Amino acid sequence: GPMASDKRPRTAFTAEQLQRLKAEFQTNRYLTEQRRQSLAQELGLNESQIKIWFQNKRAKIKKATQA
């Protein structure tokens, strides 16, 4: 993967992949299908992997439905 000895960008993320997404999440939690497509290209994931990631993170907060 994008580190030294680590996991490959499949479904599972590594520390450098997660790092990028947390920096995006901080500003805009609202990930788009278009920007998601570019995160999929560069981390070397698919769209669907990071889609799940963003939906889970937003569901952690003290909102109405879910949590």
UniProtKB/Swiss-Prot annotation:
Disulfide cysteine pairs (residue numbers): none
Annotation: DNA-binding region: 6-65
The species this protein was found in: Gallus gallus (Chicken)
Section of the entire sequence shown: 200 to 259 of 289
Signal peptide span: none
Family designation: Belongs to the engrailed homeobox family.
Location within or outside the cell: Nucleus
Protein name stated in the entry: Homeobox protein engrailed-2
